[PDB]
Design a protein around this ligand. Sequence first.
Ligand SMILES: NC(=O)c1ccc[n+]([C@@H]2O[C@H](COP(=O)([O-])OP(=O)(O)OC[C@H]3O[C@@H](n4cnc5c(N)ncnc54)[C@H](OP(=O)(O)O)[C@@H]3O)[C@@H](O)[C@H]2O)c1
Length: 313
Amino acid sequence: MASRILLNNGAKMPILGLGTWKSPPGQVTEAVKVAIDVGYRHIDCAHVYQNENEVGVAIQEKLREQVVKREELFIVSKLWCTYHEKGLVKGACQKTLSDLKLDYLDLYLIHWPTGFKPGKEFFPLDESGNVVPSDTNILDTWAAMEELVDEGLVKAIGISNFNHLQVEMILNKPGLKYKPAVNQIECHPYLTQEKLIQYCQSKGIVVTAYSPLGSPDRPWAKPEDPSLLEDPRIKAIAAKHNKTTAQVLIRFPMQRNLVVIPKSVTPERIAENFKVFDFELSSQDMTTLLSYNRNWRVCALLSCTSHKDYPFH
Ligand SMILES: NC(=O)c1ccc[n+]([C@@H]2O[C@H](COP(=O)([O-])OP(=O)(O)OC[C@H]3O[C@@H](n4cnc5c(N)ncnc54)[C@H](OP(=O)(O)O)[C@@H]3O)[C@@H](O)[C@H]2O)c1
């Protein structure tokens, strides 16, 4: 399979990237170094992950070493919810750029449609346990993202965790200057997303699938939750193809014309997870994997369920 997908800004995006949420700061520099050595050319980052400085150390070394050229890398980050105000967006982007050791991002995403009150805390909460919102809306935040393109800080802009009506709101924004290039959403056999994916693809927006392995290291995991990597039905498909369950879970979104961003800090798994361009799932395999949908979310943003822009009602 071809390694890159064409975006609606004219640039090409690698379909397989390395995730970095929960990657410990003392391990993520190695992880990114190994990833680049074994062929990864796309790294998914975010300010809220608190490890962009350490990701950047790896990127800069590999650029300095001439293992890879900057134009061959595709670095993605995300604007956190406490920076949706017009006057904070540029500085948030520039902090991410400084930390990552870059003079531009390939893609910058609005991390969630929900804006929160600015300040030091990433989740300002009230006594109900609900977030303190910002009176920003997705459309003014989008205009601020468009400015970043026009200042040369980012090559592409996009969105994350936007539902169908929120994507449509952006696409229908009065005076829209740049369409979103990407919508990054949770997607795996237990949350298959047929409706939102077809809508985005029909508009030329590329979808990136996050938590493709079901995020077994998510901090709020409960033992009774379903487990993709341990699902016997998925293990059986992997065995038939002489691949690992993770490799099946990564190949699955690729064959739906999605980008996918599995996270690992384990060198062997980083290498294994990239070895997914040597085999094909059948159409029957694809439909079988789709049949496992149960609308189960790793990331439900539960402290924000009363925010006006909460995406998952
Ligand atoms: N936009 C958003 O709101 C949002 C939300 C969630 C995630 N994301 C992005 O998507 C990325 C991926 O999602 P995720 O981190 O939630 O989870 P994930 O990629 O579904 O799963 C990561 C977990 O799987 C393990 N793992 C990796 N490869 C494996 C393999 N071959 N065999 C067995 N276990 C394996 C990792 O362990 P080790 O690391 O110990 O090897 C880690 O515990 C994130 O890191 C982040 O970049 C974005």
